[PDB]
């Protein structure tokens, strides 16, 4: 059949479910949308199903499918994400908010029929109940970042890191250091990549027809770092 990159040549429906626990506050979110790796384009709509989100939406953009990055033709031998499909991969993360708590994430990105599913479990701790996160002091926006990928030799996967800049209502900036591990689920061979990065851009929107607390996320991601 089709396997690996063959499965991303067109539009692919996406499903995102997440269970969270931040400083005891407990919530769930569901998301739907689609991704097109031909353009590196990603579109998702998220809804807090347990009422309302105890944290700011922008902090969970990262946690909410890098298999939809547009890996230009001359780099296709470094697309670890697509190479692990359809079986899938695990995505573990630890996010450090400077002078504030931290997120711990574990997720499974894999195909389940006709849909790419990213199911996550998040746990936050050590946050300041008056700080920028739990104080809902974050501007509802997102900037552009470089995601740095590196082959994890000890495992059979990759190590990834980057720093997010969440803008603050007072005009300052809160840095969120990201440290990320990916390892495949199947036993089939994957692509271990040379050092490279993904150019990420994100824009958060709002559906005016939407009554619940929600986020509309659009993402453009293109890989870079090698020379022909």
């Amino acid at each position: 059949a089709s396997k690996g990159e063959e499965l991303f040549t067109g539009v692919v429906p996406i499903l995102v479910e997440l269970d969270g626990d931040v400083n005891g506050h407990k919530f769930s979110v569901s998301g739907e949308g689609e991704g097109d790796a031909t353009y590196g384009k990603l579109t998702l709509k998220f809804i807090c199903t347990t009422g309302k989100l105890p944290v700011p939406w922008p902090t969970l953009v990262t946690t909410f499918v890098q298999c939809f990055a547009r890996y230009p033709d001359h780099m296709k031998q470094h697309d670890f994400f697509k190479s692990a499909m359809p079986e899938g991969y695990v995505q573990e993360r630890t996010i450090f908010f400077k002078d504030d708590g931290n997120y711990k994430t574990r997720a499974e990105v894999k195909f389940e029929g006709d849909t790419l599913v990213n199911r996550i479990e998040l746990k936050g701790i050590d946050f300041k109940e008056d700080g920028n996160i739990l104080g809902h002091k974050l501007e509802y926006n997102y900037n552009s970042h470089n995601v740095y990928i590196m082959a994890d030799k000890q495992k059979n996967g990759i190590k990834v890191n980057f720093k997010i800049r969440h803008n603050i209502e007072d005009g300052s900036v809160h840095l969120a250091d990201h440290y990320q591990q990916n390892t495949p689920i199947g036993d089939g061979p994957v692509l271990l990549p040379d050092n490279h990065y993904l150019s990420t851009q994100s824009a958060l929107s709002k559906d005016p027809n939407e009554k619940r607390d929600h986020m509309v996320l659009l993402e453009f991601v293109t890989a870079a770092g090698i020379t022909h």
Epitope: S2, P86, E87, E108, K110, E112, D114, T115, V117
Partner: nanobody, 127 residues
């Protein structure tokens, strides 16, 4: 490692009903689909039914549609196969099977598809 514990087989007079149950415990990865197979002594493994964990769409064998009813429990990593209008030739050992990898396409019914197998549970129909 991971283990699948079957339960709820048994002995029933024809026309009756029996409920097999299987619970996946442990394991590094989350369930994607669960199925039931059956084999009689000196005969060949048969697919009975299955269910996708996220979508919840059921798939039955020809000999089972209408009579058998497969379902989940609160996504509690537990699956149930309710059999109604049982019969003598339905006698066999019933195996629960689990698929934790991802897949693209329809749920397939071949044993290789399923990674993790239970030890089997005895279902006997007699007068």
């Amino acid at each position: 490692d991971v283990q699948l514990v079957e339960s709820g087989g048994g002995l029933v007079q024809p026309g009756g009903s029996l409920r097999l149950s299987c619970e996946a415990s442990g394991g590094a990865f989350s369930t994607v689909a669960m199925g039931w197979f059956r084999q009689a002594p000196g005969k060949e493994r048969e697919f009975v039914g299955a269910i996708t964990w996220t979508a919840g769409s059921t798939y039955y064998a020809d000999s089972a549609k209408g009579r058998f009813t497969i379902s989940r429990d609160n996504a509690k990593n537990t699956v149930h196969l309710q059999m109604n209008s049982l019969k003598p030739e339905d006698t066999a050992v019933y195996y629960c099977a689990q698929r934790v990898r991802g897949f693209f396409g329809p749920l397939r019914t071949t044993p290789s598809w399923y990674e993790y197998w239970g030890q089997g549970t005895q279902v006997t129909v007699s007068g």
